[PDB]
Amino acid sequence: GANKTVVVTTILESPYVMMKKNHEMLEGNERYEGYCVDLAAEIAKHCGFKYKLTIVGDGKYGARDADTKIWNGMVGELVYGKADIAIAPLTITLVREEVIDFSKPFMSLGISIMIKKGTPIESAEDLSKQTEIAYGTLDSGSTKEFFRRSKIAVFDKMWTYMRSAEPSVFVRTTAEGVARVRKSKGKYAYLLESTMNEYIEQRKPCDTMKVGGNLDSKGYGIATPKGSSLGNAVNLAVLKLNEQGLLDKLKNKWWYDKGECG
Amino acid sequence: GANKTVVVTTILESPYVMMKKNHEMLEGNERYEGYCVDLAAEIAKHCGFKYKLTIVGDGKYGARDADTKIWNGMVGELVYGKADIAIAPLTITLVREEVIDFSKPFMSLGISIMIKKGTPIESAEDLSKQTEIAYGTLDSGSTKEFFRRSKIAVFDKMWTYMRSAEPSVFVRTTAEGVARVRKSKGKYAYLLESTMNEYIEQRKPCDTMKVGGNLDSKGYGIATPKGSSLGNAVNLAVLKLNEQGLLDKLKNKWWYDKGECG
Numbered sequence: 001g002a003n004k005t006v007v008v009t010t011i012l013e014s015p016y017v018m019m020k021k022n023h024e025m026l027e028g029n030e031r032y033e034g035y036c037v038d039l040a041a042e043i044a045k046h047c048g049f050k051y052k053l054t055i056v057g058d059g060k061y062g063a064r065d066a067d068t069k070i071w072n073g074m075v076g077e078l079v080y081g082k083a084d085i086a087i088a089p090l091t092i093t094l095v096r097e098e099v100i101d102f103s104k105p106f107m108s109l110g111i112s113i114m115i116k117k118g119t120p121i122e123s124a125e126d127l128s129k130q131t132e133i134a135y136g137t138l139d140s141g142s143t144k145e146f147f148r149r150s151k152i153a154v155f156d157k158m159w160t161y162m163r164s165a166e167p168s169v170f171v172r173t174t175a176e177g178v179a180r181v182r183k184s185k186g187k188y189a190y191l192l193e194s195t196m197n198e199y200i201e202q203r204k205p206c207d208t209m210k211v212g213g214n215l216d217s218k219g220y221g222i223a224t225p226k227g228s229s230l231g232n233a234v235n236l237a238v239l240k241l242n243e244q245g246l247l248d249k250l251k252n253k254w255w256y257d258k259g260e261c262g
Numbered sequence: 263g264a265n266k267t268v269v270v271t272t273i274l275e276s277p278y279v280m281m282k283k284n285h286e287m288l289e290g291n292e293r294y295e296g297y298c299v300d301l302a303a304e305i306a307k308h309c310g311f312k313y314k315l316t317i318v319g320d321g322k323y324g325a326r327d328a329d330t331k332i333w334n335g336m337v338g339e340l341v342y343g344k345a346d347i348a349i350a351p352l353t354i355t356l357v358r359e360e361v362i363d364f365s366k367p368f369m370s371l372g373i374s375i376m377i378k379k380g381t382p383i384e385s386a387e388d389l390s391k392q393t394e395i396a397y398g399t400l401d402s403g404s405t406k407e408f409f410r411r412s413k414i415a416v417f418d419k420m421w422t423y424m425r426s427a428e429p430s431v432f433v434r435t436t437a438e439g440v441a442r443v444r445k446s447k448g449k450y451a452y453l454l455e456s457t458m459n460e461y462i463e464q465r466k467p468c469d470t471m472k473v474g475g476n477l478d479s480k481g482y483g484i485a486t487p488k489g490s491s492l493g494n495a496v497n498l499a500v501l502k503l504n505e506q507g508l509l510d511k512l513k514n515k516w517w518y519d520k521g522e523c524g
């Protein structure tokens with residue numbers, strides 16, 4: 001049939017997608033800015049479709065409830081046919097790959113440790129061997145799931161620690177984890193994806209830092225419903241954008257050109 | 263029909279696939295060792311197939327001849343139905359993606375600069391602004407193609423330089439590029455994928471090093487003929503192996519545990 005506007009599901013997560021200050025004076029896609037807004041425009045240009053950015057109803061990335069078997073977040077929007085594509089910092093995982101399609105990575109990343117500057121921690125092993133400095137993750141998402149599923153000895157011990165720590169070491173949002181780091185006088189470390197750690201490191205008041213190597217290696221992908229006809233074009237678009245250096249340009253723009261820490 | 267042995271095409275490229283010293287006293291897959299041999303065994307175990315490692319006829323990764331339109335190397339073996347899967351340090355590129363299927367990356371990497379220790383070069387920009395130190399790439403493969411296709415100003419200038427340099431700055435094999443670096447008294451730098459640069463850096467006589475950041479960001483994938491029924495299982499296997507930390511274990515085994523430079 002006739003072409004339709006492609007419904008893009010995304011999430012408000014700086015610097016990937018933010019509402020512009022002057023959003024009330026703008027309409028539609030122009031209300032938003034960020035790395036994923038720019039990426040969505042580049043993909044659309046290359047694939048020759050028109051699209052509407054929509055924010056995921058429940059503010060979640062995507063996980064399957066263990067009892068009800070229902071997928072939430074952006075994954076759920078794709079699975080249940082509420083959106084045609086997800087363009088977001090959405091991690092390619094095994095469990096998600098089984099239910100939706102993903103492009104090859106548009107960004108490479110790993111779980112990493114955020115500390116308040118001066119915190120005497122250099123590695124995950126360091127965290128795992130102590131409890132003076134509390135540490136946690138988002139209360140949902142691929143980072144939490146990594147620890148929950150991990151059989152690697154250090155990570156398995158960290159998960160048992162995080163699951164049992166009081167008060168709770170889990171945070172509802174990246175902003176909440178960052179503010180907890182900044183407010184805890186070195187007694188909370190935050191486990192989050194390296195690209196987000198890197199972004200925060202260039203934000204005022206420049207009091208956090210990424211420490212140690214990454215715990216794992218993975219990527220974000222553009223996601224579509226399994227079998228979607230859009231999947232192919234979009235994947236080739238990501239590959240072309242990467243090869244042309246445009247993804248590297250988008251990262252520099254949102255991380256470093258706009259950096260507040262010198 | 264009845265299950266058949268899966269024909270795996272691969273390439274002799276240390277440390278991914280090497281003939282064992284005592285190969286004449288062994289049979290079949292046991293003749294070979296390396297990161298990709300170990301990876302192939304893990305994939306096969308997870309996917310429940312039997313397989314035969316075979317070395318690509320022409321010793322090439324895969325490129326399309328501009329006139330004849332014929333694909334060579336491992337890509338060609340897949341395209342023309344001579345092999346069922348390629349398990350090798352085979353880069354996911356746009357042009358290859360259009361003709362074969364790839365898993366999500368099993369290794370992340372970027373083009374990088376190899377120098378003889380002491381060479382006064384720190385970056386691609388440094389190379390591009392001079393000619394005293396010659397520099398080149400493999401005479402075929404994704405690194406050569408990156409420069410040939412690139413419109414990024416520094417890389418475009420490097421390509422014109424490499425295409426016009428005399429004597430030729432192109433090498434037929436990684437071993438040839440490495441030996442040229444080691445034999446040129448600091449007057450040749452070699453552009454090659456970062457993981458190979460890293461591997462050589464841990465080999466005697468420990469006289470090379472990787473310098474500067476990577477020029478790009480990409481990944482190696484397991485490749486199958488477009489539409490192959492094997493593609494799905496194999497992709498989920500790579501994702502599982504990554505999440506379990508087994509890919510990181512394989513890299514440590516072949517790069518660092520076996521390292522000769524301390």
Ligand SMILES: N[C@@H](CC1=CCCCc2onc(O)c21)C(=O)O
Pocket residue numbers: 013061062089090091092138140141142143144174191192193196
């Ligand atoms: N990429 C994660 C979610 C996430 C989003 C914001 C960036 C940092 C981060 O760190 N751990 C996570 O789970 C996250 C996912 O796809 O579940």
Ligand SMILES: N[C@@H](CC1=CCCCc2onc(O)c21)C(=O)O
Pocket residue numbers: 275323324351352353354400402403404405406436453454455458
């Ligand atoms: N991965 C490359 C080929 C290649 C193989 C050996 C490792 C280092 C390397 O550096 N530049 C290349 O093209 C290579 C390809 O898929 O074309």
